[PDB]
Amino acid sequence: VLSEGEWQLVLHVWAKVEADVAGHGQDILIRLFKSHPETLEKFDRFKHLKTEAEMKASEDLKKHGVTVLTALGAILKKKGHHEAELKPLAQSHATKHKIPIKYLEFISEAIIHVLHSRHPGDFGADAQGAMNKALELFRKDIAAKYKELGYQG
Ligand code: HEM
């Protein structure tokens, strides 16, 4: 469980992300695709993008970035009590999108990197630690749903 003070740190920085959801969403998906190219191959709708400049230019990619961060924000603000938000997400990602749990670890890494770049003063070691915990809690819960369904892997 995170403590109340750890959840404060997480939601303090997130309220800054929400100042520019679209620009954060871009940076994170682009970081993921460059760091782990195999993840881009899961997206039929972005597979054609070949360079970072092409990624940056895509309005559809920027739109999806907002989709992703908006779902994550709704989860984070539930401070652990995120059963109803997380279930639909685990089901589509396991059964329709076919996303390994490992790739959720990759995009967690991408989120922490971007937060670090954009918000040093609100993202010191204590905040990074809390955010890491929050994202581990997100993964652990997702992984349990995957296991139930037969997808752990
Ligand atoms: C922070 C973790 C993530 C969140 C919050 C998340 C959230 C979402 C949301 C809310 C949607 C649209 C509705 C749905 O189909 O569920 C979506 C679609 C999708 N996600 Fe994720 N996602 C996450 C991680 C990933 C990762 C790591 C991958 C792949 C490497 C992935 C692949 C997809 C694909 C393929 C779609 C369908 C895109 C399209 O064709 O419209 N997701 N995701």
UniProtKB/Swiss-Prot annotation:
It catalyses: Fe(III)-heme b-[protein] + nitric oxide + H2O = Fe(II)-heme b-[protein] + nitrite + 2 H(+); H2O2 + AH2 = A + 2 H2O. One of its GO terms (molecular function) is heme binding. It comes from Physeter macrocephalus (Sperm whale). Pfam families: Globin. The keyword rRNA-binding does not apply. Monomeric heme protein which primary function is to store oxygen and facilitate its diffusion within muscle tissues. Reversibly binds oxygen through a pentacoordinated heme iron and enables its timely and efficient release as needed during periods of heightened demand. Depending on the oxidative conditions of tissues and cells, and in addition to its ability to bind oxygen, it also has a nitrite reductase activity whereby it regulates the production of bioactive nitric oxide. This is Myoglobin. Heme b binds at residue 93. It is found in: Cytoplasm, Sarcoplasm. The gene is MB.
